[PDB]
């Protein structure tokens, strides 16, 4: 019957994106990967690391601007 086309992901930055096979996101965050299956099934694979624990205060208050991390999405201080 109906079966997956691609893979219909949701950026943490709130932005649900389209993925055919093969296809990747390219944002700063973790690595959004789409493949098939040998039945033809779509997979979202999301390449996910740790991010380094951040000081929102530490920045803010001191002058700085909060910013998103390449590789992973989580809070960072310019």
């Given at each position: 019957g109906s079966m997956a086309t691609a893979c219909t992901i949701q950026l943490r930055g709130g932005q649900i994106?389209?993925?055919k096979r093969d296809e990747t996101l390219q944002d700063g965050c973790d690595t959004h990967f789409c493949k098939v299956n040998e039945r033809?099934?779509?997979f979202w694979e999301?390449?996910?690391?740790?991010?380094?624990?951040?000081d929102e205060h530490?920045?803010?208050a001191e002058g700085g601007?909060?910013?998103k991390?390449?590789?992973?999405?989580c809070d960072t201080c310019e």
């Open positions: 994106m389209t993925l033809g099934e779509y999301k390449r996910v690391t740790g991010c380094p624990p951040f530490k920045c803010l601007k909060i910013m991390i390449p590789g992973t999405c």
